[PDB]
Amino acid sequence: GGNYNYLYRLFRKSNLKPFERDISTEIYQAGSTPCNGVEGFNCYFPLQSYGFQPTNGVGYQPYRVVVLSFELLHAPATVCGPKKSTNLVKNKCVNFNF
Amino acid sequence: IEEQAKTFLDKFNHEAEDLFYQSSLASWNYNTNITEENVQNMNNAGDKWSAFLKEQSTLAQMYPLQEIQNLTVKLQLQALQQNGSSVLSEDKSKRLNTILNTMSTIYSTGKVCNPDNPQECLLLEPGLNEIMANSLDYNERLWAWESWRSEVGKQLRPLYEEYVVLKNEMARANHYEDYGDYWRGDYEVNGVDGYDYSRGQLIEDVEHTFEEIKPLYEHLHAYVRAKLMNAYPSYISPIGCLPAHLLGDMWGRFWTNLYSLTVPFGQKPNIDVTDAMVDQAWDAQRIFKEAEKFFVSVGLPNMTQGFWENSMLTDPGNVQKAVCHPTAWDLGKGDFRILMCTKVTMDDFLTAHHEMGHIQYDMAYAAQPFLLRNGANEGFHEAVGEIMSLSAATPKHLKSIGLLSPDFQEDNETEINFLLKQALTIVGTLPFTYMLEKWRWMVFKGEIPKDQWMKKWWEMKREIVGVVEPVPHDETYCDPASLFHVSNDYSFIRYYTRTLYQFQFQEALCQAAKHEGPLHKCDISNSTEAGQKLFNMLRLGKSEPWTLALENVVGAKNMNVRPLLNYFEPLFTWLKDQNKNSFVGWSTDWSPYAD
Ligand SMILES: *[C@@H]1O[C@H](CO)[C@@H](O[C@@H]2O[C@H](CO)[C@@H](O)[C@H](O)[C@H]2NC(C)=O)[C@H](O)[C@H]1NC(C)=O
Ligand SMILES: *[C@@H]1O[C@H](CO)[C@@H](O[C@@H]2O[C@H](CO)[C@@H](O)[C@H](O)[C@H]2NC(C)=O)[C@H](O)[C@H]1NC(C)=O
Ligand SMILES: *[C@@H]1O[C@H](CO)[C@@H](O[C@@H]2O[C@H](CO)[C@@H](O)[C@H](O)[C@H]2NC(C)=O)[C@H](O)[C@H]1NC(C)=O
Ligand SMILES: *[C@@H]1O[C@H](CO)[C@@H](O[C@@H]2O[C@H](CO)[C@@H](O)[C@H](O)[C@H]2NC(C)=O)[C@H](O)[C@H]1NC(C)=O
Ligand SMILES: *[C@@H]1O[C@H](CO)[C@@H](O[C@@H]2O[C@H](CO)[C@@H](O)[C@H](O)[C@H]2NC(C)=O)[C@H](O)[C@H]1NC(C)=O
Ligand SMILES: *[C@@H]1O[C@H](CO)[C@@H](O)[C@H](O)[C@H]1NC(C)=O
């Protein structure tokens, strides 16, 4: 029947700055005529909804996305990979790192 | 301003794709599982699509059309701004729909009763089509031909006269001169630097291409006439026209039921691989999987993998009421389904290749906007489907796909049997199609007044087609309206141009696949360069003029009849030797009653 809860914005005045976010819901104004908060020609609601349905060809089915962004300000340190410790020997001239 | 029209169409392109989807998804559930709780499920969901489109149509006239520069956004705007009906008065608009419903139910429910038994009565499709396709009795074919026209066609005569007046009013309010000029608006092309095409230019290109088929059609008409005199002696003149009730069906549209009387060498079996399919235990799925391997052989994509679950390749395991008719569906959102009820036969092995060709055409232009997702004209869509069927019916393809003894010998006697069966369907329908649209074009513009409709109809049968009526018909009959496409408001010139595009595509692809022999032995398997020649047209849609689409495959800007004649030159050479003692041509003075 269509999952109409997943929307996207399809009209904006100007492209976003990187990592900028815009949740407003003002009536878009395409033409020169002012809109006064009501719909009509050249006065469009700015949000559309994917109507997802299970019988959609691939490329039409929902994909979930996660974007990891590593940043490095100027602190002293922070999270990182998980080092690995081998086995410690004994009674042998060895090259060690503790 | 033009940038407001672009923002108009993108709201249209995302409300339409969803509303067209569920209006076509509900039409799938009715077609594959019939209840009445599905017919009411598709009539309200069908009307939400139609009510939405007239709301956006009346919004489209706020933008002018000549203040636009981009050709693509102009093409989308003109296809949506089209008024069509609704230009009439609101009491004339309901009179036109009453006529179209009355003419459609006369054709489907009209009955003919026997004069020896008035309690037995036949409909057209069960019983009257079987007499015209199977009988060899002269008196029974003459009864079924005349009684369909005198009992059903006489009811359509006062309805078709009122239909011409109301359709010419609707066409002249949309700035055409008549309704025939409205039908020729599909082939019109406006201002794309050298690729233009006028709506009156279609009339000369049909008549210029037709006078090069008349040498080939005259030798086919003379050979069939000489073979019909053995089947009906004392009924056919050796220098005259053919009687209209001895042609294989009700209207003489196809001559394909005359093959058992006109076969050149009846002691050679025409090749039929149906027994080799049931000897290797081929299921329902093998016929499509070998069809998918044909298309991936030429360099075309696989099926979409939603194609295999959602489709219904047979009638179900339930005794399930579901219109069983081969077709290809394009519901939207990249969801392609094929609906057919396939049996293990070489017939449905071939129409599997035909119906997959509609899918591969549909998968290619799916990146265009919504209003340009059709064929480039009305004739391209069926023509791409039938060059897939010609390449799969060759014995060269059948012996490499595993279905023919590697020790098979094709002789020159079986190629004549195959080519003559093709010419009874291809060449035999071309003067019928040309004559019928020429008659309907002259009726709409008024060159034929209504006191000469049936006089000019039968003069054009004797002169163009070479077919004479067995009983004289005055102006109380309407013999064109007894055909389906005339009484159900359909255009008929799409069957003429599709036949010419089909051999232009096939000859252009076989020069790219490096063929060496005759054109009728060709196969485009294992190539990649031919598929790249085909794919460059398939992805255009309606975004380009159709004359620009033809040069991407053929190399010309117009339809041409010389590739059609090159297909039939082995038959045309053999036909001119069988008509050394015959008379080629016909007389328009002889009649089967005029002695
Ligand atoms: C034809 O399809 C309809 C709906 O798709 C089927 O009707 C009902 O479908 C619902 C599912 O929403 C089931 O819960 C009901 O049991 C179905 N009705 C009945 C009477 O079974 C319908 O069953 C389908 N036709 C056939 C012959 O199965
Ligand atoms: C108007 O025409 C221009 C070219 O005549 C189209 O521009 C192309 O647009 C697509 C995506 O919109 C780009 O990927 C191409 O690179 C553009 N081509 C050029 C040469 O810049 C434009 O799409 C047309 N307008 C619409 C609404 O389709
Ligand atoms: C479509 O039909 C209308 C008549 O219903 C034609 O006249 C238009 O009338 C409307 C008002 O109902 C005006 O807004 C339009 O300006 C009129 N036509 C235009 C745009 O000049 C109209 O001409 C028809 N449109 C077509 C496709 O020719
Ligand atoms: C099929 O090919 C054979 C072999 O050439 C043809 O037989 C020849 O026919 C001509 C004309 O009748 C004769 O002059 C030759 O002598 C025949 N050849 C032999 C070896 O006898 C045959 O006519 C061809 N059939 C068709 C339908 O084209
Ligand atoms: C055309 O394509 C078919 C399908 O790939 C080729 O058929 C193969 O032929 C070889 C030897 O003739 C066999 O060993 C393979 O088993 C066949 N494959 C299949 C899937 O049946 C065929 O050879 C190709 N034609 C040419 C000239 O390369
Ligand atoms: C098409 O599908 C077959 C298996 O079904 C696969 O082997 C082949 O690689 C596919 N074609 C392409 C171009 O990936």
mmCIF file of C-alpha atoms in Angstrom, chain A residues 1 4 8 10-11 28 30-33 41-42 44-45 48-53 55-60, chain B residues 4 7-8 10-11 14-15 17-18 21-22 25 58-59 62-63 304 310 331-335 337 366 373:
data_model
loop_
_atom_site.group_PDB
_atom_site.id
_atom_site.type_symbol
_atom_site.label_atom_id
_atom_site.label_comp_id
_atom_site.label_asym_id
_atom_site.label_seq_id
_atom_site.Cartn_x
_atom_site.Cartn_y
_atom_site.Cartn_z
ATOM 1 C CA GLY A 1 0.000 0.000 0.000
ATOM 2 C CA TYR A 4 4.422 7.337 2.875
ATOM 3 C CA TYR A 8 12.528 14.313 0.966
ATOM 4 C CA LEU A 10 12.572 18.768 -3.620
ATOM 5 C CA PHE A 11 12.601 22.585 -3.717
ATOM 6 C CA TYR A 28 8.124 27.399 -1.838
ATOM 7 C CA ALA A 30 8.697 29.409 -7.853
ATOM 8 C CA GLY A 31 7.277 32.338 -9.805
ATOM 9 C CA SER A 32 7.482 36.001 -8.924
ATOM 10 C CA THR A 33 4.014 36.142 -7.415
ATOM 11 C CA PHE A 41 0.423 27.644 -9.221
ATOM 12 C CA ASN A 42 4.075 28.470 -8.578
ATOM 13 C CA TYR A 44 4.388 24.518 -3.880
ATOM 14 C CA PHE A 45 4.715 22.539 -0.707
ATOM 15 C CA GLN A 48 7.529 14.905 -1.316
ATOM 16 C CA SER A 49 7.239 11.325 -0.064
ATOM 17 C CA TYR A 50 8.684 8.142 -1.479
ATOM 18 C CA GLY A 51 5.803 5.780 -1.672
ATOM 19 C CA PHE A 52 7.765 2.610 -1.127
ATOM 20 C CA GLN A 53 6.133 -0.650 -2.064
ATOM 21 C CA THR A 55 6.961 -4.929 -5.505
ATOM 22 C CA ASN A 56 9.349 -2.226 -6.721
ATOM 23 C CA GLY A 57 12.218 -2.906 -9.053
ATOM 24 C CA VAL A 58 15.653 -2.528 -7.544
ATOM 25 C CA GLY A 59 16.720 1.068 -7.685
ATOM 26 C CA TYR A 60 13.249 1.850 -6.415
ATOM 27 C CA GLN B 4 8.438 28.151 -14.114
ATOM 28 C CA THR B 7 9.362 23.551 -11.832
ATOM 29 C CA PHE B 8 5.832 22.703 -12.919
ATOM 30 C CA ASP B 10 8.931 18.133 -11.665
ATOM 31 C CA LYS B 11 5.979 18.279 -9.334
ATOM 32 C CA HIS B 14 6.606 12.770 -8.973
ATOM 33 C CA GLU B 15 2.860 12.817 -8.420
ATOM 34 C CA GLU B 17 4.628 8.121 -11.252
ATOM 35 C CA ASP B 18 2.984 7.004 -8.028
ATOM 36 C CA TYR B 21 1.642 2.852 -10.454
ATOM 37 C CA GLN B 22 -1.276 1.855 -8.259
ATOM 38 C CA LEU B 25 -1.136 -2.349 -10.128
ATOM 39 C CA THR B 58 -6.119 22.590 -17.205
ATOM 40 C CA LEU B 59 -3.154 23.884 -15.216
ATOM 41 C CA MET B 62 -1.270 28.862 -17.885
ATOM 42 C CA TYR B 63 2.080 28.477 -19.569
ATOM 43 C CA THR B 304 15.389 -7.475 -13.557
ATOM 44 C CA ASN B 310 5.928 -11.303 -9.852
ATOM 45 C CA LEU B 331 3.538 -0.756 -14.203
ATOM 46 C CA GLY B 332 6.209 1.808 -13.331
ATOM 47 C CA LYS B 333 8.985 2.296 -10.781
ATOM 48 C CA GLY B 334 11.148 -0.179 -12.674
ATOM 49 C CA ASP B 335 8.680 -3.060 -12.274
ATOM 50 C CA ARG B 337 5.953 -8.120 -15.654
ATOM 51 C CA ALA B 366 13.215 4.187 -18.302
ATOM 52 C CA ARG B 373 8.271 6.912 -22.030
#
